[PDB]
Ligand binder design. Structure first.
Ligand SMILES: [Cl-]
Ligand SMILES: [Cl-]
Ligand SMILES: [Mg+2]
Ligand SMILES: [Mg+2]
Ligand SMILES: [Mg+2]
Ligand SMILES: [Mg+2]
Ligand SMILES: [Mg+2]
Ligand SMILES: [Mg+2]
Ligand SMILES: [Mg+2]
Ligand SMILES: [Mg+2]
Ligand SMILES: [Mg+2]
Ligand code: NA
Ligand code: NA
Ligand code: NA
Ligand code: NA
Ligand code: NA
Ligand code: NA
Lengths: 160, 154, 95, 186, 140
RNA sequence: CCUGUCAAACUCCAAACUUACAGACGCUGUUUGACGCGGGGAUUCCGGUGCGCGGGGU
RNA sequence: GAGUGCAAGAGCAAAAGAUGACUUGACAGUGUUCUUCCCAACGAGGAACGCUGACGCGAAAGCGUGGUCUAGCGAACCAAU
RNA sequence: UUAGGCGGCCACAGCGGUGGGGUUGCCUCCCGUACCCAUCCCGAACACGGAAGAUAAGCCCACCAGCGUUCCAGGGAGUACUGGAGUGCGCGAGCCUCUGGGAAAUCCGGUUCGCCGCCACC
């Protein structure tokens, strides 16, 4: 279904699983990517993707975007290139749907999303000064699969 | 000592606000009262801040107004030096005006109506939708800013 | 509310902050107030007996005689005057 | 200790010298507490009252200032106990104090114990204290008869220092006699 | 310093953890005083469901009664190292345990103003071996 | 140790703010009698909207 | 963090928990007050707190108006007692 | 207070650690079971009786901040949030300005190794 149905952060925080049940598994394959043995300190360049609007991102999008992003890094930097990107947000907010009309309308659990306040870092990849234009491209594709507009902001790196 | 001038109507105005305005002796738009600067008084003007225009007027200006708009506690009697003299603890309007600003007495303690019912601002005011810092007319003013209003409504 | 008992919604007010936990001191439980004195009502989470209906926490009544050891404190609920039977353990002197 | 949630006992509870649950029941009577306390070599008797910043001792009596009136025997036994109580009870009387409740602190209500003795003495001093006549040691053991009979099994003096050989519970009588006396500088 | 620090046996406990009696007899004769029924807590599948119920006995020995037990007890044992408590105590064996401590333990066992014994006054495995070993036998 | 996130039914913290009582100023009442008390007569118990805070619901 | 009969939230450590012993206050009578029903009228029911009488326990202060607290309840008429 | 008893506030008092302190004084540990009393077994404890020894415990005294806590400075931050106002902006979600309030985490440096009342006492 549309993200139009869940992109806003108007409902209350719904995460207490000691009361919620039947929560679908996170489609997010993995948060840690690249060479997860090396450190972010071992890299000169650090580029993050910043969500400009406060929103909710269903795990379907986190995966969808995170995927098409890392999938690119792999393609341009080999399956074991010298980089390491990270998805720092997790889908804690449970989402329901009222799928009887408005009678007993409390919805049934259907998914999970991650609340990101505008200005936060959804992604943060670390690379060497040469792969920067690749890590940037990995992000230009990733921000095309999530509700908000984003900024690709370079952190440590004036080697331009 | 500040001059309060209600610039916005009562309709839709919060009640606890309107009641404060009334406690400050103002019951109509364009009415003005001379309030001292105390913790208690500042607490009230703060609450009324959005529907009024206030500040400390210059002796000169206060005099023009007292002369032009002051009234007894009852009756038409024009307040002038002679009136002031024959009725108040002072010798003339200035003598009074000085006492008000110096906060030694109040329009009431002198058989004067607590309110100076001014005239609409000649040439209009800076608007009742924005404060002074935005070019409006609501809020605190310069001793000069307040005078323009008080005198425009002279 | 889902139910309408006396302790409904008193999770916060009738509970102690961890460090105030445990048996309260005896001094304030024996305090002797005099009629007319203004007092503050606040149930002591650690003291079981001598309580009053939670609704009145925060009230500041006036001691007006006692009943047995407990005190009879007059208060005004909204606009209605009421007399509250409470022991010192749950009282403080105003000022 | 551990963290922010940790609950530290009230000081006198840490020290383990005040039983608050019992202290509260005590304070309830409203009467002054007759604090009965012992020591290896001594026995103290205080008449305490409540106060704004703590308790008020209006009258006391320590087994040591007992000799100040003639005592020449040890100061941590029954005759000593009773006597210390009577003394405090007398000063108590002098202070305007009339009734009191027995605070035996962390001690045990063992029948005939020194505290009840302290209590018995104070009561005799004219103080009204809720007691139980038959929880008290019999008049003779108060005199210090059990002790004299122990030195009877002499062979070796029960007393190192010089104070008789078979001991003197009479000294007990002589001292009580001395207090019961109206004069005596309290 | 030495005097008010040199070890001493405070108690020697001797018990028999059966699991359901006629044992109280031997413990009586062997020690020199009456035994004590030993009850248990929690139900056990090993037909030990009954909570409060005789399951063993013990005897707490103090002073002569205790030494005069060890004088014959200790012999029947080949004391070791790993057999010592951290507080300088030790058990072996029918069970026989030896509680050791220095001249001021009453401070932690009384009622009035009690207090736990400072570590710097606790007994040690080593300091334990010493005192004991120094009494008709060998260590490890 | 290091490193990445959360909570309507979590809280080592913690507002604004709401609230009891008292004093002060203000305002008000003592011929316009306030506050309050006793009594007669009702109507009314389909509400709606804006704003703020909400809970449900694409 | 145990336990405290049962939801949930809350209370409790020389105890409100455990063990032991003794005991029947889970007593009779009659009230004050709060709650039921915030404010603000409304019954049954409930609780807190007193008095009178008689008792239990304790050395005693004291504690016991059932179970640590908030659920476990029912008019008139008629019957039985 | 050259070591005591009863407390109030109930961690600023907790946790941990170092140094010092007691011949007829104090508190203790300590010595010891005829008695009062005592252990579902132990004079361990409780209770009673007492001074041969000790300052090692405890306790009193001086001090240490590593942990926990109290308060304060600076920084975070007038940030987050927010009572009042707006024909200010934004498709919208939401934001902004004026007015009155104003955190929390964390960092850095101080603080804190209790304070106070009554009684007794070379
Ligand atoms: Cl109540
Ligand atoms: Cl004592
Ligand atoms: Mg007029
Ligand atoms: Mg014109
Ligand atoms: Mg205009
Ligand atoms: Mg709440
Ligand atoms: Mg509210
Ligand atoms: Mg009860
Ligand atoms: Mg019928
Ligand atoms: Mg029947
Ligand atoms: Mg030393
Ligand atoms: Na249906
Ligand atoms: Na987008
Ligand atoms: Na408490
Ligand atoms: Na009723
Ligand atoms: Na048995
Ligand atoms: Na010492």
């Amino acid at each position: 279904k549309p993200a139009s149905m869940y992109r806003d952060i108007d409902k209350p925080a719904y995460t207490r699983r000691e009361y919620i049940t039947g929560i679908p598994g996170s489609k997010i394959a993995q948060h840690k990517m690249g060479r997860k043995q090396k450190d972010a300190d071992d890299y000169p360049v650090q580029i993050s993707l910043i969500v400009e609007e406060t929103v909710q991102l269903r795990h379907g999008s986190l995966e969808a975007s995170r995927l098409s992003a890392n999938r690119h890094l792999i393609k341009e930097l080999g399956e074991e290139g010298d980089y390491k990107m990270t998805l720092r947000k997790f889908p804690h907010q449970v989402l329901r749907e009222n799928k009887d009309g408005m009678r007993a309308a409390f919805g049934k659990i259907v998914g999970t999303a991650a609340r990101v306040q505008a200005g936060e870092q959804l992604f943060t990849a670390y690379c060497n000064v040469e792969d920067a234009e690749h890590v940037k491209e990995a992000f230009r594709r990733a921000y095309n699969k999530i509700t908000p507009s984003c900024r690709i902001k370079v952190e440590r790196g004036e080697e331009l | 000592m500040h001059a309060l001038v209600q610039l916005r109507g009562e309709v839709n105005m919060h009640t606890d606000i309107q009641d404060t305005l009334e406690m400050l002796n103002i019951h109509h738009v364009n009415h003005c009262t001379l309030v001292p600067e105390t913790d208690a008084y500042r607490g009230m003007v703060a609450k009324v801040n959005d529907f009024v225009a206030f500040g400390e007027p210059s002796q000169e200006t206060l005099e023009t107004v007292l002369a032009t708009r002051a009234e007894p506690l009852e009756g038409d009697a024009d307040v002038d030096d002679e009136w002031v003299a024959e009725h108040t603890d002072y010798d003339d309007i200035s003598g009074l005006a000085f006492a008000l600003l110096s906060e030694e007495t109040t329009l009431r303690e002198q058989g004067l109506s607590p309110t100076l019912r001014l005239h609409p601002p000649r040439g209009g005011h800076d608007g009742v939708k924005h404060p002074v810092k935005e070019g409006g007319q609501l809020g605190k003013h310069d001793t000069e800013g307040i005078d323009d209003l008080l005198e425009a409504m002279r | 509310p889902s139910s309408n008992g006396p302790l409904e919604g008193t999770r916060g007010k009738l509970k102690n902050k961890p460090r105030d936990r445990g048996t309260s001191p005896p001094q304030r439980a024996v305090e002797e107030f005099d009629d007319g004195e203004k007092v503050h009502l606040k149930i002591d989470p650690s003291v079981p007996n001598g309580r009053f209906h939670p609704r009145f926490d925060g009230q500041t009544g006036t001691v007006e005689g006692k009943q047995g050891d407990a005190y009879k404190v007059d208060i005004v609920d909204g606009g209605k005057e009421k007399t509250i039977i409470v022991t010192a353990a749950h009282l403080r002197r105003q000022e | 200790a551990t963290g922010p949630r940790y609950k530290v006992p009230m000081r006198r509870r840490r020290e383990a010298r005040t039983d608050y649950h019992q202290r509260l029941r005590l304070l309830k009577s409203g009467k002054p507490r007759l604090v009965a306390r012992k020591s290896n070599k001594h026995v103290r008797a205080q008449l305490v009252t409540l106060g704004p910043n703590g308790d008020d001792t209006l009258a006391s009596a320590h087994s040591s200032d007992l000799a100040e009136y003639g005592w020449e025997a040890p100061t941590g036994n029954m005759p000593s106990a009773y006597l210390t109580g009577l003394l405090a009870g007398l000063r108590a009387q002098e202070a305007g104090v009339e009734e009191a409740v027995l605070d035996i602190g962390l001690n045990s209500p063992t029948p005939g114990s020194k505290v009840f003795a302290i209590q018995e003495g104070a009561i005799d001093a004219g103080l009204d204290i809720p007691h139980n006549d038959d929880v008290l040691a019999d008049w003779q053991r108060t005199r210090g008869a059990h002790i004299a009979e122990y030195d009877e099994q002499l062979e070796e003096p029960l007393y190192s220092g010089d104070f008789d050989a078979a001991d003197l519970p009479e000294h007990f009588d002589e001292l009580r006699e001395t207090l019961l006396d109206g004069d005596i500088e309290l | 310093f030495h005097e008010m620090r040199e070890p001493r046996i405070e108690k020697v406990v001797v018990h028999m953890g059966i699991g359901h009696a006629n044992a109280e007899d031997i413990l009586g004769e062997i020690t020199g005083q009456m035994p004590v029924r030993t009850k248990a807590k929690r139900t056990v599948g090993e037909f030990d469901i009954r909570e409060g119920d005789p399951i063993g006995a013990k005897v707490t020995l103090r002073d002569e009664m205790a030494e005069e037990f060890l004088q014959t007890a200790l012999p029947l044992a080949e004391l070791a190292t790993s057999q010592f408590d951290d507080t300088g105590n030790f058990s072996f064996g029918l069970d026989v345990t030896v509680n050791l401590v220095r001249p001021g333990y009453r401070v932690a066992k009384r009622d009035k103003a009690s207090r736990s014994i400072p570590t710097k006054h606790r007994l040690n495995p080593a300091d334990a071996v010493a005192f004991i070993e120094s009494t008709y036998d060998v260590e490890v």
